[PDB]
Each structure stands twice: as C-alpha cells, then as structure tokens.
Amino acid sequence: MLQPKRTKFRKVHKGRNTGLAHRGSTVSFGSIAIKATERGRMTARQIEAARRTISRRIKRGGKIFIRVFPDKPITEKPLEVRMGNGKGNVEYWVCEIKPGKILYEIEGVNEDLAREAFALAAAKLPFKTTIVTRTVM
Amino acid sequence: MRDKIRLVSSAGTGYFYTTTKNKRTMPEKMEIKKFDPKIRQHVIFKEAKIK
Amino acid sequence: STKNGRDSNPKMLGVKVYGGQTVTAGNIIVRQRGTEFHAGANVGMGRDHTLFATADGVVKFEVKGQFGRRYVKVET
Amino acid sequence: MRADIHPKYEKLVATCSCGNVIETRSALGKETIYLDVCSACHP
Amino acid sequence: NEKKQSRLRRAKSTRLHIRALGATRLCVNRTPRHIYAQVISADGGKVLAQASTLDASLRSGTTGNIEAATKVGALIAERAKAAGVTKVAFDRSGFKYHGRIKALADAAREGGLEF
Amino acid sequence: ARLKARYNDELKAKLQEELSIKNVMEIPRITKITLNMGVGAAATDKKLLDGAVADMQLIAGQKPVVTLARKSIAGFKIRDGWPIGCKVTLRGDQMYEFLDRLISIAIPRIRDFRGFSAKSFDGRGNYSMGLKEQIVFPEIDFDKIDRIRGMDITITTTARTDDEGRALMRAFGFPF
RNA sequence: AGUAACGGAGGAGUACGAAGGUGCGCUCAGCGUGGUCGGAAAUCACGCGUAGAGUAUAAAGGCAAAAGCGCGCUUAACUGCGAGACCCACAAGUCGAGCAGGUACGAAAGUAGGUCUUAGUGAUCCGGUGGUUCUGUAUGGAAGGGCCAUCGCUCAACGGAU
RNA sequence: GCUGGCGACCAUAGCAAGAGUGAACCACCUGAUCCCUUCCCGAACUCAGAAGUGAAACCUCUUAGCGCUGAUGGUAGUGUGGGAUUACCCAUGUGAGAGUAAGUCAUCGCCAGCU
RNA sequence: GCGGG
RNA sequence: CGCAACCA
Numbered sequence: 081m082l083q084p085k086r087t088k089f090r091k092v093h094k095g096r097n098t099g100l101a102h103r104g105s106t107v108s109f110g111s112i113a114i115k116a117t118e119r120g121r122m123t124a125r126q127i128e129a130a131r132r133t134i135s136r137r138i139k140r141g142g143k144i145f146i147r148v149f150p151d152k153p154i155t156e157k158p159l160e161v162r163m164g165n166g167k168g169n170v171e172y173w174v175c176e177i178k179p180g181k182i183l184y185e186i187e188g189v190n191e192d193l194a195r196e197a198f199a200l201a202a203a204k205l206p207f208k209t210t211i212v213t214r215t216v217m
Numbered sequence: 218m219r220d221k222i223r224l225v226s227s228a229g230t231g232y233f234y235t236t237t238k239n240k241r242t243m244p245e246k247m248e249i250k251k252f253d254p255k256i257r258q259h260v261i262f263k264e265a266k267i268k
Numbered sequence: 269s270t271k272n273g274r275d276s277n278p279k280m281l282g283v284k285v286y287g288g289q290t291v292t293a294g295n296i297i298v299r300q301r302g303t304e305f306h307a308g309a310n311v312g313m314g315r316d317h318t319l320f321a322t323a324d325g326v327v328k329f330e331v332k333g334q335f336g337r338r339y340v341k342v343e344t
Numbered sequence: 345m346r347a348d349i350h351p352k353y354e355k356l357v358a359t360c361s362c363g364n365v366i367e368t369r370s371a372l373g374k375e376t377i378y379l380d381v382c383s384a385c386h387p
Numbered sequence: 388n389e390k391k392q393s394r395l396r397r398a399k400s401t402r403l404h405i406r407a408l409g410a411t412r413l414c415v416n417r418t419p420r421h422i423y424a425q426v427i428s429a430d431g432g433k434v435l436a437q438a439s440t441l442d443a444s445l446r447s448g449t450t451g452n453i454e455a456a457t458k459v460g461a462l463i464a465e466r467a468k469a470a471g472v473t474k475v476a477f478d479r480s481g482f483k484y485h486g487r488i489k490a491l492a493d494a495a496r497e498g499g500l501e502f
Numbered sequence: 503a504r505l506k507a508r509y510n511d512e513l514k515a516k517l518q519e520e521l522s523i524k525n526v527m528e529i530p531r532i533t534k535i536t537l538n539m540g541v542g543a544a545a546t547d548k549k550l551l552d553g554a555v556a557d558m559q560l561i562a563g564q565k566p567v568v569t570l571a572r573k574s575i576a577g578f579k580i581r582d583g584w585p586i587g588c589k590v591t592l593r594g595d596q597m598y599e600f601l602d603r604l605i606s607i608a609i610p611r612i613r614d615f616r617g618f619s620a621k622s623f624d625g626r627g628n629y630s631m632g633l634k635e636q637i638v639f640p641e642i643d644f645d646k647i648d649r650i651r652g653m654d655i656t657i658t659t660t661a662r663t664d665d666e667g668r669a670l671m672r673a674f675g676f677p678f
Numbered sequence: 679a680g681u682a683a684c685g686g687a688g689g690a691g692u693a694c695g696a697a698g699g700u701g702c703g704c705u706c707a708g709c710g711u712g713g714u715c716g717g718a719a720a721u722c723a724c725g726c727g728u729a730g731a732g733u734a735u736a737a738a739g740g741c742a743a744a745a746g747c748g749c750g751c752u753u754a755a756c757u758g759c760g761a762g763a764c765c766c767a768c769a770a771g772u773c774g775a776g777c778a779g780g781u782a783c784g785a786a787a788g789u790a791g792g793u794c795u796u797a798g799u800g801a802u803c804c805g806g807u808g809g810u811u812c813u814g815u816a817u818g819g820a821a822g823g824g825c826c827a828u829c830g831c832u833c834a835a836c837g838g839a840u
Numbered sequence: 841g842c843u844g845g846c847g848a849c850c851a852u853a854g855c856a857a858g859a860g861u862g863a864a865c866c867a868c869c870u871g872a873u874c875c876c877u878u879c880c881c882g883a884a885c886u887c888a889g890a891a892g893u894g895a896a897a898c899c900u901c902u903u904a905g906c907g908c909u910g911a912u913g914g915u916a917g918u919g920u921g922g923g924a925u926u927a928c929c930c931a932u933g934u935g936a937g938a939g940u941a942a943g944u945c946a947u948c949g950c951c952a953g954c955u
Numbered sequence: 956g957c958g959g960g
Numbered sequence: 961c962g963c964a965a966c967c968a
C-alpha cells in the first residue's frame with residue numbers, strides 16, 4: 081500500500097473535507113476512468129485492493145493509472161487510554177476524495193472489459209462512483 | 218563564562234564602569250578611553266577586580 | 269507524556285496607525301520583526317525595525333522603487 | 345607595484361649550448377647557461 | 388558596462404543618504420576627457436546650476452586634468468551662488484574623492500559653496 | 503621584454519592576415535597569465551606551506567598571494583578561511599617576460615617532453631597548461647629545491663574562439 | 679491585536695574589546711568549460727547565474743544604502759536627559775526624534791547612547807565595595823544611617839512563604 | 841536628429857534574436873615619471889595624455905518566440921435572513937484564483953553639448 | 956579556611 | 961581528598 085517516502089511532519093490536523101474536485105476531474109492519461117461522485121476518505125489499503133481487482137480482471141492488457149495517492153496520516157489512540165496525554169499514533173494513510181475526482185484510469189482496453197473491471201473495483205470503495213469517458217472539451 | 222570587572226577611572230575620581238570579559242582570550246588588564254562625568258572629560262579606565 | 273507544551277508570550281506586532289490618520293512626532297506606526305515596511309519621508313526606524321513618525325502629518329502607505337518596497341511616509 | 349614586497353629582477357643574458365644567445369629580465373641574479381633552447385630541441 | 392555598473396553601485400549609498408537628508412546636491416561626473424558638476428535640487432529632478440569643461444572658456448584649452456577641474460569648480464561655485472545655492476552635499480558619484488574630484492571640490496569650497 | 507615589442511611590431515599583422523580580422527582592435531592579444539599552485543597539505547607542515555610561495559617569488563618576479571578556501575569540504579579536511587592555495591597574476595612587462603623565460607629558457611627542459619596538449623581552450627581563447635615539478639625553472643635550483651610540488655599556469659587572452667587562441671599561441675612559438 | 683488543551687514542532691539560562699563605531703571597498707550559492715597530483719565536491723581561468731549562499735546561535739520576519747564579506751583608524755558597549763508613542767491589572771517591558779557636554783570616524787553633508795531583530799533571565803529584604811560638605815541623639819568628631827555607582831540567589835515550583 | 845548627466849516610473853518598460861551609430865560626446869585606448877592604488881598584479885582605483893578603433897561595451901532601431909499585462913463570461917469562496925446537517929440549498933449583497941480573447945519591443949521631466 | 960595529592 | 965565554618 082502506497083505511502084510517502086518521507087514527510088515534513090508526522091501528525092496532521094483533521095481538517096474539513098469540503099467543496100468539489102475541479103482539478104483531478106478530467107480523463108488525462110487513458111481512455112476510460114472511474115470517478116468519485118461522492119465525498120470521503122480513501123485509505124491506502126482500499127487503493128491497493130481496487131488496483132488488484134482491476135488488474136487481475138483486465139489481465140495485464142492496457143495500463144492502469146492510479147490518480148489518488150494517500151498522503152494524509154491518520155492517528156489513533158491505543159485501546160483503553162483516556163482522553164489526554166497528547167496525540168495518538170499514526171496508523172494508516174488516506175487520500176481525501178471530493179466529488180468529481182478521478183481515481184483510476186484505463187488506457188489500451190476496450191470499453192466493456194474496462195467497465196467490468198470498474199464495476200469490480202467499485203464494490204471495494206466506500207463512496208459511490210461512476211464510469212466516465214475521455215472527451216474533447 | 219565571562220567574569221565581571223570594573224573599569225576604574227585613572228583621574229582620581231571614584232568613577233567606574235562595569236563590564237564582563239573572557240579571562241582566557243584576554244588575560245591582560247583592559248585599558249580603554251571613556252568619559253568620566255565627574256571631571257566631564259575622556260580619560261583612561263583600567264581594569265580592576267569586581268568588588 | 270509528549271515533548272510539546274511550550275510557546276512564548278505574545279508580542280503585539282503590527283500596524284498601529286493606518287493610512288490617512290494624523291500623527292504627532294514620535295508616534296509609533298509599525299511594530300515589525302524585519303522591514304516589511306520601509307521608512308519614507310518623515311519616518312524613522314528604531315533598532316528593532318520600529319517605524320515611527322518624526323513629524324506631524326498624515327500617514328501614507330505606498331509601493332515604491334524597483335524592488336517594489338512598501339513605504340510608510342508622513343505628509344506634513 | 346608595491347616596492348619593498350617583491351623580489352629583485354634584473355637583466356640576464358642566456359648562453360645556449362647551440363649558439364642562440366638570448367636576453368631576458370629575470371631573477372636568476374647571474375648569467376644563464378642553457379643546454380636546450382627553442383631552436384635546439386625536438387619541437 | 389561593468390565599470391559603470393560597479394561605480395553606480397558605489398554611488399547609490401551616498402545618493403540615497405543625500406535624498407533622505409533632503410539637501411541640495413553637488414553631483415559630479417568625470418570622464419577621461421572632461422569633467423562636469425551639477426547643483427541639483429533636493430527632489431532630484433531640477434538642475435539649479437551646472438558647469439563643465441564644455442563652456443567656450445575651458446573647451447578651447449585642455450580638459451581632463453586637475454587644472455581644468457579647478458577651473459570648473461570655481462565656475463560652478465560662482466553659478467551656484469548666482470542662483471542662491473549655498474549649503475550643498477557633495478556627491479562624488481562613486482569616484483574616489485582624491486584627485487580631479489578633490490580639485491573641483493576645493494575650488495568649489497573656496498568659491499563660496501558651503502560643505 | 504622581447505616578446506612584447508615582437509608582438510607589437512611583427513606578430514600583429516601576421517595574426518591579422520592569418521586569422522582575417524578586419525578591425526585592428528579586434529585582434530587576438532594576450533591579457534594575463536596566472537600561475538596557481540594548489541597545496542592541500544597546508545595544516546600538516548610549513549616546508550610545503552611557504553615553500554610554494556617562496557618558489558613562486560623566485561620563479562615569478564612578483565610575490566604570491568595565499569588563496570584561502572571558500573567552503574568546508576569534509577572529505578578534503580578543509581574549513582572555511584584556511585590557506586589552501588597560492589597564485590600570482592602577471593599582467594604586463596612581466597607577463598611577456600614570463601612567457602619568454604618559460605617558452606625559450608625553460609619550455610624544453612622537462613624529461614621526455616612530447617610537443618604539448620593543444621585541445622585545452624575552455625571554449626574561448628584561454629589556455630591552461632600544467633607542470634609536474636619546478637626543476638625546469640632556470641631560477642629555482644635543484645640544490646635549494648625541497649618537497650617538489652607542481653604548478654598550474656593559465657594564459658587568458660582577448661580571443662573569441664579556440665582558433666584565434668591557437669593562432670595567438672602559435673605566433674608566440676608554443677610547444678603545440 | 680489577543681486567544682485554550684497532559685494540542686503539533688523546535689530553541690534559551692549565552693557569546694563578542696571585536697563579532698562594537700566609523701570611512702572606504704567587495705558580492706554570493708550553484709552550474710558548464712578547461713587546468714599538477716586533484717577525484718562527483720579544495721585552489722586557478724573563463725562564461726553564464728533564476729537569490730537558491732551567508733547571518734555567533736533555534737525559527738520566523740528581514741537583509742543591495744546590503745543587515746552578508748574585507749581593510750584603516752578607533753571606543754558612542756559615552757554622561758545628563760528626553761517630546762511623543764507602543765504594550766500593559768500592577769510591578770515591569772519596548773521604541774524614540776531632539777537638546778547639552780565630551781568624543782570617534784569622515785574632505786564634507788553626516789553617522790555612532792553596542793551587536794539584523796525577536797530568547798540569554800530573578801522583585802523585595804539583609805549585607806559587601808567605591809564615592810558623597812546629606813545626617814550625625816548635649817557639643818565637636820566618629821560609629822551608624824541616607825544618596826549615587828556596583829556586587830552577592832538553578833530564590834529553575836523562575837511574582838521568589840522560612 | 842543625436843548624444844551625456846540627474847530624476848519620475850518600476851517589465852504594456854523585460855529577455856531572446858537580428859541591425860546601426862564615431863562631427864562632437866561616450867567607450868575602448870597609450871604610458872605610468874608624479875598624486876594615488878594591489879592581502880600579488882596600473883585588472884580595478886588614480887594620474888599624465890590623444891596614435892588609433894567603434895572590435896568589445898553602451899546607446900538607438902526592428903521583431904510577440906518567451907516573459908509581463910489582461911478583459912467579458914462562468915466558477916469557487918463569503919456578510920445578512922431563512923431552510924437542511926456532512927457542508928449544502930434558497931433570497932439578497934459581494935465576488936476570486938486559474939484559464940480564454942486581447943495588449944505589449946515604454947511614457948514623462950530638468951540641464952548641458954553637438955549637428 | 957585549614958592540611959593532603 | 962578530608963576536617964571544620966553557612967541567617968540575601
């Protein structure tokens with residue numbers, strides 16, 4: 081599962097996930113893409129699982145472009161500790177997902193096999209997704 | 218550390234200044250020209266032990 | 269136990285007199301760490317880069333020079 | 345040039361071993377006796 | 388280029404200080420052939436007086452030495468007093484103060500200019 | 503001494519013709535010659551520390567300067583501002599004298615001397631030679647010599663291309 | 679502007695008579711290309727060079743009139759002050775033009791009341807040392823006290839209870 | 841019509857690429873005896889000059905290639921009132937950044953000299 | 956503040 | 961290194 085090789089800071093504020101994804105919202109690396117129409121978090125484990133189910137299905141024909149990278153560390157308190165005593169320990173990494181974000185792109189595969197692969201990947205993710213095609217403006 | 222020292226006026230007046238000095242990089246007694254306000258004049262102040 | 273509990277007291281920096289206000293000589297205009305504002309006419313700078321009015325007048329901020337510096341000046 | 349800092353450099357005649365007597369202002373303090381020259385070499 | 392660029396870098400400090408003092412400036416320029424002096428206002432835009440080795444009184448002679456500089460200094464002192472300019476700040480403009488510049492400045496001090 | 507008036511009277515028209523330079527001013531001239539002698543072993547002793555300066559003051563008519571170090575390279579065992587070099591810049595009436603006293607009284611004085619290395623121009627008309635010992639110098643004697651070091655020399659000329667530099671160095675009778 | 683948490687990160691309890699003042703001068707870091715070892719990375723030369731170097735020291739804000747780097751001479755790391763401000767429960771803290779005296783540097787306009795700034799600190803009590811036509815228990819002295827200068831606290835639980 | 845100096849203004853002014861200027865001026869230039877310089881060096885600084893050359897440099901022209909400027913519209917955000925609670929919606933006010941069309945190879949002032 | 960190293 | 965002196 082993906083992870084930054086290094087970061088400036090270990091722990092990070094929680095923040096608010098708000099707004100739409102106007103940046104990573106266009107098919108730019110391949111011909112078909114899966115796009116999140118709902119908001120949430122995407123752990124690195126989910127990214128690995130969805131990539132595995134897509135790649136095993138399309139059977140190595142065509143390239144897969146992972147367009148999300150998990151760069152936000154998430155902490156957790158150990159079990160049976162009270163509420164003070166500093167911030168919890170890093171457990172896993174997530175990517176914040178705004179509606180409109182491209183998650184995976186497939187290049188070099190026909191539409192039906194890629195749509196099968198994307199349907200298989202959607203059942204591994206915690207938000208609703210859609211299948212979008214590359215257009216010209 | 219730096220030791221405290223007096224710079225006493227060589228004019229007879231009891232006027233002095235206080236400063237610090239590094240005793241290793243400056244073992245000799247400091248001599249410096251300063252204004253004595255009791256005679257209203259620049260004279261030489263020599264180093265002395267803090268009292 | 270973690271190792272983060274420290275901070276320093278506030279310093280109360282910033283613009284004290286804004287553009288258009290009247291000043292007298294000696295009035296402090298800007299408390300700043302560096303020179304994000306530079307002294308123009310009738311403005312002096314203290315040892316800690318404090319900008320103060322050296323004359324009566326009104327305060328005026330500008331951007332001047334080829335380095336695009338922010339300048340405070342006092343109009344007499 | 346600063347005076348009392350540099351070395352002394354006076355005239356100097358150069359006696360080559362192949363009849364090419366030269367003249368140059370150098371700091372040898374004597375008369376040079378050369379064997380090899382820019383005429384008596386394999387250049 | 389490099390010479391003029393470095394010399395203007397050398398002049399900037401005195402020029403900015405003279406502007407901050409709000410003073411009438413006696414700016415001098417020196418070329419291998421001529422010398423120039425300008426008495427300039429505190430705002431830096433108006434030339435209150437001027438003199439050079441191009442004056443129909445120094446040009447016909449020889450220019451670019453210490454004697455011509457002394458003559459220019461006398462002439463600028465006179466012309467500056469004519470325009471009611473007494474207290475000035477001397478701007479050597481990145482040139483060393485010694486030499487032809489010093490001759491101009493001494494002739495200007497003896498001419499009546501106060502600095 | 504000789505080389506200066508020689509270039510002023512003979513080599514000028516020769517270079518202008520051979521190189522086809524229209525303007526008189528834009529003709530290849532020799533501007534400076536700098537003799538550097540890097541000595542990294544400075545903090546270890548004094549023989550090879552002031553010996554380079556003394557060998558220079560003997561070889562070059564002008565005294566040397568002590569090139570310090572600009573940074574602190576750990577693998578090199580140097581710290582910022584420590585004497586790690588020496589240099590001397592011959593400019594005029596001494597640069598031509600050094601060109602003579604090294605090109606006609608000490609040029610062919612090194613053991614097994616092939617012609618030269620003639621592909622060192624630095625994209626312009628500035629050449630850089632090299633030397634392995636000071637024994638070739640007719641000034642430093644092998645009796646008084648000690649802790650043999652070598653000197654690098656660099657001739658900087660007012661030349662544009664490497665061809666103009668090659669011409670200006672040939673007219674002065676280089677080892678090619 | 680201020681703003682809490684056993685919230686997230688780091689520093690301090692010094693240094694320096696020059697690393698202060700002033701006048702004068704200077705401009706990096708990185709690349710390419712060449713050159714005795716010498717080599718990716720030392721010193722030399724030449725071309726660029728977008729601020730990416732440096733700053734006694736942590737970070738931030740600054741830094742070309744460089745606030746960065748050198749050389750000469752120096753003691754303004756002065757005394758009496760101080761309009762007016764900032765910040766402040768108080769006690770404290772901060773900046774300060776200008777004025778007088780005595781200076782240093784500069785040809786001169788000028789610039790200097792320490793250091794690029796923001797940490798490098800400790801009240802009061804008790805006592806020590808220097809000075810002092812203030813006082814001096816009948817009087818003259820003295821002791822003692824006062825005043826000005828300064829010294830003695832990981833009083834660190836740092837407004838310090840003995 | 842050209843130079844010189846000092847400013848305003850700080851890229852619509854800049855880079856890159858071409859091109860031209862020697863009456864004067866400016867630059868390079870000649871030499872350092874003298875005044876001054878170099879942690880070495882007349883390179884720089886300084887002085888005495890006028891045999892050359894506009895080569896380099898400066899300056900002036902030309903060019904949207906890159907920079908820089910830059911709408912309109914839309915979008916994001918947001919004050920107030922209201923409605924929903926995963927961050928939106930409605931009414932009203934405000935309104936970017938980015939990007940697009942387009943614009944840019946400056947404008948102005950005081951003084952002197954030369955044509 | 957008195958001796959030892 | 962020990963013995964002894966400690967009331968900002």
Ligand SMILES: C[NH+](C)c1cc(NC(=O)CNC(C)(C)C)c(O)c2c1C[C@H]1C[C@H]3[C@H]([NH+](C)C)C(O)=C(C(N)=O)C(=O)[C@@]3(O)C(O)=C1C2=O
Nearest residue numbers: 333334335336337728729742849850851853854899908946
């Ligand atoms: C108006 N701009 C275009 C300009 C004009 C001139 N020219 C003059 O004023 C004098 N010469 C003219 C009048 C043009 C003939 C300029 O001389 C300059 C500049 C720009 C500045 C920009 C500087 C800038 N920083 C230091 C504020 C900067 O970061 C850069 C850079 N390349 O990153 C600079 O180049 C800059 O330092 C600089 O050199 C400028 C000028 O010199």
Ligand SMILES: C[NH+](C)c1cc(NC(=O)CNC(C)(C)C)c(O)c2c1C[C@H]1C[C@H]3[C@H]([NH+](C)C)C(O)=C(C(N)=O)C(=O)[C@@]3(O)C(O)=C1C2=O
Nearest residue numbers: 334335336337338392705706726727728729740741742744
């Ligand atoms: C050091 N100064 C003289 C300078 C010079 C040049 N250019 C050169 O050196 C020219 N290069 C040659 C040698 C001619 C090829 C420069 O190019 C620059 C600068 C200054 C810096 C200043 C920077 C500054 N901050 C970041 C330190 C800053 O805040 C500004 C600003 N305007 O606010 C800058 O402009 C700055 O970022 C900057 O760009 C500089 C230069 O570019």
Ligand SMILES: C[NH+](C)c1cc(NC(=O)CNC(C)(C)C)c(O)c2c1C[C@H]1C[C@H]3[C@H]([NH+](C)C)C(O)=C(C(N)=O)C(=O)[C@@]3(O)C(O)=C1C2=O
Nearest residue numbers: 334335388391392393395396728850851853854855907908
């Ligand atoms: C317009 N300014 C902001 C500017 C920008 C750039 N561009 C960059 O450096 C871009 N670099 C990036 C990629 C953005 C990091 C620039 O590169 C430059 C300059 C300024 C010019 C000014 C030139 C000027 N002219 C008259 C020759 C000049 O005389 C000077 C001077 N007297 O200092 C210059 O500095 C100048 O030659 C110069 O170097 C500029 C730039 O290089």
Ligand SMILES: [Mg+2]
Nearest residue numbers: 304335336337
């Ligand atoms: Mg800035």
Ligand SMILES: [Mg+2]
Nearest residue numbers: 397400703743
């Ligand atoms: Mg300076």
Ligand SMILES: [Mg+2]
Nearest residue numbers: 334335728729
């Ligand atoms: Mg810049």
Ligand SMILES: [Mg+2]
Nearest residue numbers: 802803804968
């Ligand atoms: Mg008590």
Ligand SMILES: [Mg+2]
Nearest residue numbers: 814815817819
């Ligand atoms: Mg009594």
Ligand SMILES: [Mg+2]
Nearest residue numbers: 810823824825
């Ligand atoms: Mg008493």
Ligand SMILES: [Mg+2]
Nearest residue numbers: 835836837838
């Ligand atoms: Mg307590």
Ligand SMILES: [Mg+2]
Nearest residue numbers: 835836837838
């Ligand atoms: Mg407390």
Ligand SMILES: [Mg+2]
Nearest residue numbers: 912913914935
């Ligand atoms: Mg709009």
Ligand SMILES: [Mg+2]
Nearest residue numbers: 911936937938
């Ligand atoms: Mg816009």
